[PDB]
Short mmCIF file of C-alpha atoms and ligand atoms in Angstrom, two decimals:
data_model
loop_
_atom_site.label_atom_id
_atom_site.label_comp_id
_atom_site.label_asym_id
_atom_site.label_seq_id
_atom_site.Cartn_x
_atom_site.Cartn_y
_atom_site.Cartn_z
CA UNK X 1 4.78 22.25 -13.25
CA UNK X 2 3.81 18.63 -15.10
CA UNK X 3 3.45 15.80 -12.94
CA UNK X 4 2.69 12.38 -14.60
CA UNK X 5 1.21 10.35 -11.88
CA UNK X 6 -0.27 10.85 -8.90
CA UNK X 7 -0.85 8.04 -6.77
CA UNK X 8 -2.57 8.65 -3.15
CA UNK X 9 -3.19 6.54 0.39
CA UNK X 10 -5.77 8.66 2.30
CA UNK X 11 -4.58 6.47 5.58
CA UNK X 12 -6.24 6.35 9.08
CA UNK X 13 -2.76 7.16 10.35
CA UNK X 14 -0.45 8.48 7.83
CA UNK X 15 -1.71 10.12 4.03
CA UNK X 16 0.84 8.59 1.41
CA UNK X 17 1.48 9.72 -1.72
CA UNK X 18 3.79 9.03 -4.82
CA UNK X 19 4.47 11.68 -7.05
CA UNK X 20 6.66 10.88 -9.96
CA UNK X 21 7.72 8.17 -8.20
CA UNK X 22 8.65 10.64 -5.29
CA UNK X 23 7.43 9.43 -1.52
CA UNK X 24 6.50 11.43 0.67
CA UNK X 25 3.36 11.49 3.77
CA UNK X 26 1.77 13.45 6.47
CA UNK X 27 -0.15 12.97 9.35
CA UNK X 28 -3.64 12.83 8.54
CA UNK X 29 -4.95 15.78 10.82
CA UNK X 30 -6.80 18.39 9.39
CA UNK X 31 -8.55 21.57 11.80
CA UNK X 32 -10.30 23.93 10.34
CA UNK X 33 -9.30 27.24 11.45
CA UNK X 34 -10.74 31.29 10.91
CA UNK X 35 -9.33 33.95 9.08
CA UNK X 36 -8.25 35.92 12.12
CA UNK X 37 -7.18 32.49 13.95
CA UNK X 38 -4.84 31.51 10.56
CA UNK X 39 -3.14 35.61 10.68
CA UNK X 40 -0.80 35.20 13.24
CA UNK X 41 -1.13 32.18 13.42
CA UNK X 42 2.23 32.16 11.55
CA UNK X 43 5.13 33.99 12.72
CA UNK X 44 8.42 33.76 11.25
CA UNK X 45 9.16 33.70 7.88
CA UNK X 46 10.19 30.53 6.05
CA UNK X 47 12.46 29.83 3.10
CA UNK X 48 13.72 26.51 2.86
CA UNK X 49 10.84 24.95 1.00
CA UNK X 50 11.15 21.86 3.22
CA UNK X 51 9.91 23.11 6.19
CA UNK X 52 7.05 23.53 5.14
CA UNK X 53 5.39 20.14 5.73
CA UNK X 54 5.63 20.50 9.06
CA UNK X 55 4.15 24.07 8.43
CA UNK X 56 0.87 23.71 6.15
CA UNK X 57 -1.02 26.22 6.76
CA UNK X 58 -3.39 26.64 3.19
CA UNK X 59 -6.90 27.94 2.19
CA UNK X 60 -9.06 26.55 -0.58
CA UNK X 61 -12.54 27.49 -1.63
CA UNK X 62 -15.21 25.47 -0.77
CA UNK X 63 -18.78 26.14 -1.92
CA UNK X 64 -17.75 29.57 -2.59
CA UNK X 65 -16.65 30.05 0.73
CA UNK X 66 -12.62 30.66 1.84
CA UNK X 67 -11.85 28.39 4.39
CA UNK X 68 -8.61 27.99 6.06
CA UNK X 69 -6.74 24.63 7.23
CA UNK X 70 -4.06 23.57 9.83
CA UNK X 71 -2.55 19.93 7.76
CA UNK X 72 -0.42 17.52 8.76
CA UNK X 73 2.39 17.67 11.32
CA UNK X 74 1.02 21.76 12.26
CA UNK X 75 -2.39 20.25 13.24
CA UNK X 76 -1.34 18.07 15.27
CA UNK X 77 -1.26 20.31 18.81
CA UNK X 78 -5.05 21.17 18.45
CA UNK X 88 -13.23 6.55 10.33
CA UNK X 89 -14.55 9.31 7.97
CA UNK X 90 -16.54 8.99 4.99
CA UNK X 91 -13.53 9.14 2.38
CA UNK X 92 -15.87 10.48 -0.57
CA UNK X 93 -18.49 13.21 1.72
CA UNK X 94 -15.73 14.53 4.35
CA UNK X 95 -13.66 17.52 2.59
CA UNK X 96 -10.14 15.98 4.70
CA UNK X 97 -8.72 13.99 2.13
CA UNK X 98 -9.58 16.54 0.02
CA UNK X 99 -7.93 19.48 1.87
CA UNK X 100 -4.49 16.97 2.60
CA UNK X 101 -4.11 16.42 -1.46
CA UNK X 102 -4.42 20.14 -2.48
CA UNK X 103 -1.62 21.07 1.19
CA UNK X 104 0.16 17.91 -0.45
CA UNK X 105 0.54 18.79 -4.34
CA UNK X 106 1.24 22.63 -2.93
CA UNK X 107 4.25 21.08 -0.46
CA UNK X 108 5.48 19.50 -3.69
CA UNK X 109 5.56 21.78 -5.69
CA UNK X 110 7.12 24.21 -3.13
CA UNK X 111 9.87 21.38 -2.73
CA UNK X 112 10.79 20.66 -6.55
CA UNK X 113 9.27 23.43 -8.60
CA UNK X 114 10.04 26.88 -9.09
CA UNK X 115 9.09 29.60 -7.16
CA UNK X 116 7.01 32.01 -9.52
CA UNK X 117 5.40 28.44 -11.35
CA UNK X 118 1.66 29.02 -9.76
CA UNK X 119 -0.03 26.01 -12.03
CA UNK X 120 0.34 22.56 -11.58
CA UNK X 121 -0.93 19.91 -13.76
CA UNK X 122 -1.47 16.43 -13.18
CA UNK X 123 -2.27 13.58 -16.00
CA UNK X 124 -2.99 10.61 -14.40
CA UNK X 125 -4.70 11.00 -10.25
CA UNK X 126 -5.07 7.65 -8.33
CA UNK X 127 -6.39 7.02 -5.15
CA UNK X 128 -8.74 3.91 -3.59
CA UNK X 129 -11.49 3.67 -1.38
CA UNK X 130 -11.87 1.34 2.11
CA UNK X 131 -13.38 -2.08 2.05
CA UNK X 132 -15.64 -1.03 5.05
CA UNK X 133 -16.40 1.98 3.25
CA UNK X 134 -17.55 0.12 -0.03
CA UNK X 135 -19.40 -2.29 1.22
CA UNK X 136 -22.20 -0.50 2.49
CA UNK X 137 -23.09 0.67 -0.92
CA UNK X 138 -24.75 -2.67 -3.47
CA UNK X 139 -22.00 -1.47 -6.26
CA UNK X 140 -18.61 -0.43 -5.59
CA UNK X 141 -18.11 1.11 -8.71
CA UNK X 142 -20.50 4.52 -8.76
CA UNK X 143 -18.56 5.09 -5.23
CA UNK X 144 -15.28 4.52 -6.60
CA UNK X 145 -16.56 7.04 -9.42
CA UNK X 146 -18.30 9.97 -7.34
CA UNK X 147 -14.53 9.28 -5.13
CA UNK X 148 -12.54 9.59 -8.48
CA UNK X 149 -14.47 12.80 -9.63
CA UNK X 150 -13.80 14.36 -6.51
CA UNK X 151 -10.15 15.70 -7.59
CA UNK X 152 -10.62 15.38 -11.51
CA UNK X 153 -10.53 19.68 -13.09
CA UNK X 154 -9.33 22.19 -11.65
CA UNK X 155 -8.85 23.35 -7.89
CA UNK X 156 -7.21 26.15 -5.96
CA UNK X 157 -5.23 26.48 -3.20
CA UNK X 158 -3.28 29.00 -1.04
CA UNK X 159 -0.33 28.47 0.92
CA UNK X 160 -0.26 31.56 3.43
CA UNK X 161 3.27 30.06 4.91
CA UNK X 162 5.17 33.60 5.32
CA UNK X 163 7.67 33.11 2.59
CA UNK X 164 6.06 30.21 0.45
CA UNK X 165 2.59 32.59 -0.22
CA UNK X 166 0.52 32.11 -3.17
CA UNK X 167 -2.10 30.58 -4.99
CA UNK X 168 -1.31 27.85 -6.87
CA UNK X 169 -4.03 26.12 -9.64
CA UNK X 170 -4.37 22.86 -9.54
CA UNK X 171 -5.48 20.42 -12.97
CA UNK X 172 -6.25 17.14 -13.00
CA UNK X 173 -6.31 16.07 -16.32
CA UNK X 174 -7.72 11.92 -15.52
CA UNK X 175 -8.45 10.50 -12.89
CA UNK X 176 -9.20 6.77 -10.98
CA UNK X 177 -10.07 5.34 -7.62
CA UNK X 178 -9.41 1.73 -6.68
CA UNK X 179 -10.43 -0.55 -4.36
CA UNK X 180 -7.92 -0.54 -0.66
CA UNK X 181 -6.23 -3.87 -0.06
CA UNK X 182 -7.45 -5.34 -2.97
CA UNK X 183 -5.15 -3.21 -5.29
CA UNK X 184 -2.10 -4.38 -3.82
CA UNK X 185 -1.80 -7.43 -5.16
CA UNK X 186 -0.81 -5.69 -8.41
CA UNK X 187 2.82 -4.72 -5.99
CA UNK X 188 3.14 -8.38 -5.84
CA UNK X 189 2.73 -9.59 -9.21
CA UNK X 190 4.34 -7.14 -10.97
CA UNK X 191 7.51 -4.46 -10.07
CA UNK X 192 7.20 -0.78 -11.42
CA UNK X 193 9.03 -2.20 -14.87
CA UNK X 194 5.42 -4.53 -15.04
CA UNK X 195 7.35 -7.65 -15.07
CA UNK X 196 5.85 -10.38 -13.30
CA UNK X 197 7.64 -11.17 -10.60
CA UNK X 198 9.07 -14.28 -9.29
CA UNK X 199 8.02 -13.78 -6.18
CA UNK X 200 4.20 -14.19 -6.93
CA UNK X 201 4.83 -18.03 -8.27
CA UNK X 202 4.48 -18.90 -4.60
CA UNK X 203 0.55 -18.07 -5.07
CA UNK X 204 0.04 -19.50 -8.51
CA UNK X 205 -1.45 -22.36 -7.11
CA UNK X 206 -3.16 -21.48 -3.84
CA UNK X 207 -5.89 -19.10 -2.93
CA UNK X 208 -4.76 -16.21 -0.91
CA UNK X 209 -5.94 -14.29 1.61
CA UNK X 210 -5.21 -10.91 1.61
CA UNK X 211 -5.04 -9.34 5.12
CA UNK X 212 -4.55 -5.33 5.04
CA UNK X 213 -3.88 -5.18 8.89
CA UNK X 214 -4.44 -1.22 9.96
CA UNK X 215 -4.61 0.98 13.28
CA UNK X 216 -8.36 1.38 12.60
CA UNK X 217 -9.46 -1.40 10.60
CA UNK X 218 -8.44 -5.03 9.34
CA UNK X 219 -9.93 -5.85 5.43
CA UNK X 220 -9.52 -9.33 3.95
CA UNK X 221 -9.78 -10.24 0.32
CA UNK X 222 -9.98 -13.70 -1.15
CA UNK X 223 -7.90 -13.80 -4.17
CA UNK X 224 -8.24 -17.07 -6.33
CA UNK X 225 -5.11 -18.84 -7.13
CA UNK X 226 -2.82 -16.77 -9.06
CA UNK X 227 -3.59 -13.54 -7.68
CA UNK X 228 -6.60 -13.02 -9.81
CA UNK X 229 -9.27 -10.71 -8.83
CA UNK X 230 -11.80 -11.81 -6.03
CA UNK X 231 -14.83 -13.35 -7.34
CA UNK X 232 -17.53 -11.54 -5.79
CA UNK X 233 -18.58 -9.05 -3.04
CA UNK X 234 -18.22 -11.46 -0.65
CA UNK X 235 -14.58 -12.22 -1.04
CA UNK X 236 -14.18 -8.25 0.43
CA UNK X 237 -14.19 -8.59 4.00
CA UNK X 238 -13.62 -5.46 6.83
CA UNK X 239 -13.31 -5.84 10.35
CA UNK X 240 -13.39 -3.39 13.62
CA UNK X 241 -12.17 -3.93 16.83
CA UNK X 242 -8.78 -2.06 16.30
CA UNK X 243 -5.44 -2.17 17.21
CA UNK X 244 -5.43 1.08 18.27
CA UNK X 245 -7.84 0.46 20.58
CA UNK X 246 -6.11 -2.25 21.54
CA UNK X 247 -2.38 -0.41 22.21
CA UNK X 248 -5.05 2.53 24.34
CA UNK X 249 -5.96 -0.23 26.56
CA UNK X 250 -1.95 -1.68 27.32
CA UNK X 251 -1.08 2.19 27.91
CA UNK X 252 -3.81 2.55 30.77
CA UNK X 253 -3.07 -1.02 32.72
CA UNK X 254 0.42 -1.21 32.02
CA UNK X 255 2.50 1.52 30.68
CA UNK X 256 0.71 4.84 32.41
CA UNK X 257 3.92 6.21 33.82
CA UNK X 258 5.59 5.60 29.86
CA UNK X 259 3.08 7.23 27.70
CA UNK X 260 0.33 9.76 28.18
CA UNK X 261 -1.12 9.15 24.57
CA UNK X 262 -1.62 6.27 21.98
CA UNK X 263 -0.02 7.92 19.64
CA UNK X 264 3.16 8.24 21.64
CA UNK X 265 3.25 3.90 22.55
CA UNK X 266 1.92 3.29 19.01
CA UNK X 267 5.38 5.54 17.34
CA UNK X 268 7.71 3.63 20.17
CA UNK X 269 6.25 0.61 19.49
CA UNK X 270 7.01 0.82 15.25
CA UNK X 271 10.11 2.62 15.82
CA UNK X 272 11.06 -0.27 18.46
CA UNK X 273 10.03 -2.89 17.46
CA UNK X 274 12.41 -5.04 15.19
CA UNK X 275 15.28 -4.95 17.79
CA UNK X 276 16.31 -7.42 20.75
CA UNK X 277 15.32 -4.21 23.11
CA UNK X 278 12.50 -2.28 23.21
CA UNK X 279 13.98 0.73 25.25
CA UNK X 280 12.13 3.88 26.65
CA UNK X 281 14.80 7.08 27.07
CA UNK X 282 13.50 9.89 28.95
CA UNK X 283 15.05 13.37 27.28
CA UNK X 284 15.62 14.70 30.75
CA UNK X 285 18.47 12.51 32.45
CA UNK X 286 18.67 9.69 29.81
CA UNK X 287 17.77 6.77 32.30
CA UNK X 288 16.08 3.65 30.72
CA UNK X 289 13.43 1.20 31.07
CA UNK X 290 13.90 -1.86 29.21
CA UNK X 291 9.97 -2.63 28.11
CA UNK X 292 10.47 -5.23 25.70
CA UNK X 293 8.57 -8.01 27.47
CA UNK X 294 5.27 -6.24 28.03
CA UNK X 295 5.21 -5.27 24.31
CA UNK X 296 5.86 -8.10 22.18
CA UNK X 297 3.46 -9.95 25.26
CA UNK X 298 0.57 -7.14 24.05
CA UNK X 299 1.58 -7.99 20.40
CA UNK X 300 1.00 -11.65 20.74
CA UNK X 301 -1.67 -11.37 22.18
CA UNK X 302 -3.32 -9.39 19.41
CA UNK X 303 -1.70 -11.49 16.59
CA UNK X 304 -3.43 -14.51 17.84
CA UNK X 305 -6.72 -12.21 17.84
CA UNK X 306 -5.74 -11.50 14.10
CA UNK X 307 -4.66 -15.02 12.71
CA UNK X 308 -7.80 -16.27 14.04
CA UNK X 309 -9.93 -13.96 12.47
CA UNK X 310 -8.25 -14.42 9.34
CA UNK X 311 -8.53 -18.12 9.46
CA UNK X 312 -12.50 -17.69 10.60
CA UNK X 313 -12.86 -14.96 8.05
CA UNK X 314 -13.46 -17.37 4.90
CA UNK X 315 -13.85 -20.74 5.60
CA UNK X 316 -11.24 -22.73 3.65
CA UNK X 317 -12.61 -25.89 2.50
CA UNK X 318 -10.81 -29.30 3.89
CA UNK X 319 -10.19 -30.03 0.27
CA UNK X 320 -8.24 -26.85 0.24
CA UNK X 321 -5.09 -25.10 0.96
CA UNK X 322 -4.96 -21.13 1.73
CA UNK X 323 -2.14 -19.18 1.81
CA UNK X 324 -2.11 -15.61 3.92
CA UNK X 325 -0.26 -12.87 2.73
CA UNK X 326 -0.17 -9.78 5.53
CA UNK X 327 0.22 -6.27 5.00
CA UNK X 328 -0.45 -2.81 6.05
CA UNK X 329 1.46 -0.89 8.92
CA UNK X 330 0.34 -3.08 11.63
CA UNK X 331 1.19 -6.75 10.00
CA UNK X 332 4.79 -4.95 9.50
CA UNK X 333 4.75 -4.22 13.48
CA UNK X 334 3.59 -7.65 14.07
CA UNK X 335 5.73 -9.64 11.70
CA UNK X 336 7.67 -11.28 14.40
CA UNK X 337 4.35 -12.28 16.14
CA UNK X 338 3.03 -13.80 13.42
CA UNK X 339 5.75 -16.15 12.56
CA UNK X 340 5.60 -17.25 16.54
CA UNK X 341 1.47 -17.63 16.60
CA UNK X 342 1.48 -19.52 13.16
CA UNK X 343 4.16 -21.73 14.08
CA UNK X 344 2.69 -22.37 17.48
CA UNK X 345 -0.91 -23.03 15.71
CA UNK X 346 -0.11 -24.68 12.35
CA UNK X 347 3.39 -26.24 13.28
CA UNK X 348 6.66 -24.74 11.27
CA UNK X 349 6.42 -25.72 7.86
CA UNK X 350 2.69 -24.37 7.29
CA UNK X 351 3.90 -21.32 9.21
CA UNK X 352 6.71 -20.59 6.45
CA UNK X 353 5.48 -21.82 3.63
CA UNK X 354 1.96 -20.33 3.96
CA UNK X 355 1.64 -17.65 6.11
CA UNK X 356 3.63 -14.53 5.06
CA UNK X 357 4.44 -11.23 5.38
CA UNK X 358 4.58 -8.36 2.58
CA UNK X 359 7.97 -6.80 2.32
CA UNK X 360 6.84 -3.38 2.28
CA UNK X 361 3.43 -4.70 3.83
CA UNK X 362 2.99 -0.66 5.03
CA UNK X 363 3.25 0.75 1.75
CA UNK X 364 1.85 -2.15 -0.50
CA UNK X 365 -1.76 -0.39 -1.11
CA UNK X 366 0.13 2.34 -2.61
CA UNK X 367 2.56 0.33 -4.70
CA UNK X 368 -0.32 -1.49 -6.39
CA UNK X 369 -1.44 2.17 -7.39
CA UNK X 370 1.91 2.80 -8.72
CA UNK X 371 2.13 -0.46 -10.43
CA UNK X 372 -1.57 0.45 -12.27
CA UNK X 373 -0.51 3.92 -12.80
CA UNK X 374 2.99 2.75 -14.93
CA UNK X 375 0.73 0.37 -16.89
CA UNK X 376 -1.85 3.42 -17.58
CA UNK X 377 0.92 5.80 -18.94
CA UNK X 378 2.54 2.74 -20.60
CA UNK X 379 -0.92 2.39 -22.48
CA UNK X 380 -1.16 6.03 -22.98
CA UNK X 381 1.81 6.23 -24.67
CA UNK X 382 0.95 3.11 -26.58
CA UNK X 383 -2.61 4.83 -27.81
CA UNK X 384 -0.59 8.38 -29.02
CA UNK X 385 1.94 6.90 -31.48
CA UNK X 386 -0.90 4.28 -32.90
CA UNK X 387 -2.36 7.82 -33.68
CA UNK X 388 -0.47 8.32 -36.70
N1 ADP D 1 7.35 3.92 9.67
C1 ADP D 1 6.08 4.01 10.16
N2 ADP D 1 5.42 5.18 10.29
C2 ADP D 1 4.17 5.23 10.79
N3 ADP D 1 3.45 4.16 11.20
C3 ADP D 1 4.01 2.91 11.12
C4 ADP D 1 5.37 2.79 10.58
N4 ADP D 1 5.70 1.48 10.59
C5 ADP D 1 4.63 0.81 11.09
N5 ADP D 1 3.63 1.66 11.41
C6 ADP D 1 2.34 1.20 11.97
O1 ADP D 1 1.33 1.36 10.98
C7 ADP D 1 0.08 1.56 11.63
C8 ADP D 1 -0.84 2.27 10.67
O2 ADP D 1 -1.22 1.27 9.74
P1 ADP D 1 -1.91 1.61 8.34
O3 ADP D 1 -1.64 0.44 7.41
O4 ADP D 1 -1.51 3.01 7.93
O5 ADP D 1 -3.45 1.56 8.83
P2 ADP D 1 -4.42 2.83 9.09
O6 ADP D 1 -4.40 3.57 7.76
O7 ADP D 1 -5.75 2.21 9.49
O8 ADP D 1 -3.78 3.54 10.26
C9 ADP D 1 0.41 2.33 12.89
O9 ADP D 1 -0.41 1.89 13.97
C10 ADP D 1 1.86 1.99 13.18
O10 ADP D 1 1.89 1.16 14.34
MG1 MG D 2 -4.47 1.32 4.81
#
């Protein structure tokens, strides 16, 4: 199997991928298992290649050792260093296998891959004085060739993985390149809003909130210092509304923080035990929590660089949680700024969950575009 591009979102929360233009994630959990622990482990046999995301059970080799790996969804029962930790790893070789279970042919045990693209984390940059020779050693990491077993009853076998090029970016940063251009690389009307006006970037995440100061027109930041990360996360934040306020409603983050996105959006926010169906309407203490945490973000944002009072910023916000709090932004701003600096100039991403990745996919249709380009010039 040939796949063209490869474009991959090692998330806190969710690993994102586009393959082909093909979405698909995973929940980032990966548990290292034994031999014995990983044989029956497993079961029933499976043969509907789609079930097997929520059944990723592989083995790769790892320093000439065979180690075996609950991913995703099947680890799930039981802030890394991106580049060191073998995780992200282990999720793109379970990944690439999954898809190539789900489109590709059964007795195909080679994949090959032309153009890999992933990014690093602000936070995880910045302790290093150049970006670059991290974004390098993080890039090497899945260029060549890797193996990987699926020992899913029905979907066994080893499949080879080659990747032929490969590039890592820099989170938050790289998504500007979803708003200036669309997958065709046309610029996009939508971007003359910022072709005047500095912009800050805010990536808003479960685990970590990363601002970048783009100079007007979307062009890249000036220096290390326009690359900003911040912890004291939402997550943390959602833990603490559980335990004071919502104890009888959820007995885990995870469970208020998938209500919460799933809910949010709608005039009620409604909690529907399986059992007898009955409902609690907890809409108010939510979007209460939420506000409460926007006004935590805007003012960081605002604090984070100092506009000049000979200047105008505009805010552009993004990642999962600025989608979650979209509504609670355009209430805070308008409450801090007044209504027409609240529409005009502070906004949220359409697709502010997934823009990280779409910048990759923009990058990675202007790479094969220049590929192609480079072959015909070679005659
Ligand atoms: N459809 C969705 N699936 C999963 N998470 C979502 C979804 N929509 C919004 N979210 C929110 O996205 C957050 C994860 O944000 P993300 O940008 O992935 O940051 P991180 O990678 O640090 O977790 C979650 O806390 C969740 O509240
Ligand atoms: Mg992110």
């Amino acid at each position: 199997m040939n796949i063209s591009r490869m474009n991959v979102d090692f998330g806190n929360s969710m690993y994102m991928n586009l393959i082909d233009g093909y979405f698909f994630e995973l929940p980032t959990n990966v548990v290292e298992i034994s031999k014995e622990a990983a044989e029956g482990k497993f079961t029933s046999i499976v043969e509907d290649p789609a079930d097997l995301k929520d059944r990723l059970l592989v083995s790769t080799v790892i320093d000439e050792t065979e180690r075996y790996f609950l991913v995703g969804e099947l680890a799930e029962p039981e802030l890394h260093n991106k580049v060191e930790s073998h995780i992200p790893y282990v999720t793109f070789l379970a990944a690439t296998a999954y898809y190539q279970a789900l489109k590709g042919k059964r007795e195909d045990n080679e994949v090959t891959i032309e153009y890999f693209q992933t990014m690093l984390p602000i936070w995880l940059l910045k302790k290093l004085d150049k970006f670059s020779e991290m974004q390098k050693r993080m890039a090497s990491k899945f260029l060549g060739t890797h193996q990987v077993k699926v020992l899913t009853l029905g979907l066994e076998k080893e499949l080879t993985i080659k990747v032929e090029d490969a590039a890592c970016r820099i989170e938050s940063e790289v998504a500007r390149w979803a708003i200036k251009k669309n997958f065709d690389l046309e610029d996009k009307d939508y971007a003359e809003q910022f072709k005047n006006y500095d912009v800050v970037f805010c990536d808003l995440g479960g685990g970590t909130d990363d601002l970048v100061l783009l100079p007007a027109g979307l062009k890249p930041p000036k220096s290390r210092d326009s690359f900003v990360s911040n912890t004291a996360p939402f997550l943390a934040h959602l833990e603490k509304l559980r335990k004071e306020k919502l104890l009888e409603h959820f007995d885990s983050v995870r469970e208020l923080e998938k209500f919460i996105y799933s809910n949010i959006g709608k005039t009620k926010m409604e909690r529907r035990d399986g059992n007898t169906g009955q409902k609690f309407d907890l809409t108010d203490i939510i979007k209460k929590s939420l506000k409460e945490y926007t006004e935590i973000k805007i003012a960081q944002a605002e604090n984070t660089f100092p506009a000049p009072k000979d200047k105008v910023y505009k805010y552009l916000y993004f990642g999962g949680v600025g989608e979650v709090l979209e509504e609670s932004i355009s209430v805070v701003t308008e409450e801090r700024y007044g209504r027409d600096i609240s529409e005009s100039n502070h906004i949220v991403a359409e697709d502010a969950r997934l823009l990280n990745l779409y910048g990759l996919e923009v990058l990675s249709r202007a790479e094969q575009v220049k590929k192609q380009a480079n072959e015909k010039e070679a005659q």
